[PDB]
């Protein structure tokens with residue numbers, strides 16, 4: 001069983017450098033070149049280059065020449081990718097790959113049978129930040145005759161992700177938690193909403209549960225109808 | 230260099246249907262296809278135009294007519310959805326997102342509008358939120374109006390995955406203003422256009438009303 005094992009995802013600021021590692025098993029490391037390929041969501045995949053574990057010969061794509069360095073450690077069957085002077089355009093999932101045909105005698109590099117699970121790298125000038133949670137209270141402007149709507153606005157946090165639940169998971173029906181959006185500020189914002197019988201507003205109590213592990217912050221905001229005298 | 234151009238950009242189908250996607254390449258070569266399941270690593274599906282990789286079912290087949298390659302996936306299964314990329318040598322297509330859309334009868338959005346919270350207002354910013362709940366199909370247009378003035382460049386919008394059970398979508402749009410500008414106006418309106426609506430629908434509120 002041929003396999004490629006990758007190091008985890010990283011968070012960088014612009015200007016910094018990163019090292020990713022790819023470790024092989026199930027075959028003789030020295031026989032095949034190893035490739036690095038980045039996939040930015042919604043953009044064309046970019047082959048960055050290959051490295052030959054035997055010899056350390058290297059070949060980089062023209063756009064990365066001067067800023068990237070590939071190396072291996074034959075003691076551990078590990079290949080390394082280092083990228084310098086990072087910018088937001090370097091945000092992507094970084095994969096290592098290996099060709100399909102590989103024996104002790106020959107190989108062929110370009111049919112990528114074997115991929116690592118990928119290392120997600122985000123380059124942003126933002127620093128990790130716990131969100132602010134705001135009530136999206138129900139009213140007459142959210143009561144459609146018999147069924148109402150309420151929610152929570154989870155604003156200005158970084159990085160992804162946050163988890164949101166209602167009544168500690170008790171409430172799940174009619175709940176829509178939306179995909180976060182990225183703001184000019186470089187910070188994320190998302191909303192979670194749930195529709196319920198306007199009849200219940202009076203009795204039933206609704207609480208949204210927001211957890212943002214990266215900043216180790218956990219908030220429970222109660223969402224109720226605004227009191228009008 | 231080799232240029233690879235895939236089409237379409239997006240393909241929306243229901244399981245059981247067959248997906249057909251194309252790659253045009255700028256020179257003769259060995260062309261492969263890769264599938265990326267959401268949040269997963271790409272996997273090799275077909276190489277040299279029409280040869281299936283190990284463990285790939287015959288539902289996948291590739292054909293070629295000169296510079297033009299088609300990848301067809303018959304009898305779509307949940308695990309076949311994702312984005313597909315063609316590749317020659319060092320180069321890749323921009324990808325085709327093959328995603329599930331299940332048909333249902335048209336369902337108009339339910340529109341709710343939410344004013345900024347008092348909590349948020351204590352702090353310089355005001356977010357107005359408009360919810361379009363449980364509609365189909367996915368195509369919907371949201372426009373913000375302040376004192377009847379059409380807004381633009383100051384909203385962001387997000388849509389959920391099609392519901393598993395009722396096959397509806399939901400959309401959330403946020404209009405963000407400084408607290409100061411917010412207090413310069415009275416009427417905040419969300420206007421919604423959708424196939425289920427005989428005509429645009431507006432939800433409005435007036436600043437400072439309970």
Ligand SMILES: *[C@@H]1O[C@H](CO)[C@@H](O)[C@H](O)[C@H]1NC(C)=O
Pocket residue numbers: 249250251294298299
């Ligand atoms: C290749 O796929 C395209 C995309 O749908 C399709 O229109 C065209 O008919 C296919 N080519 C052939 C020869 O069937």
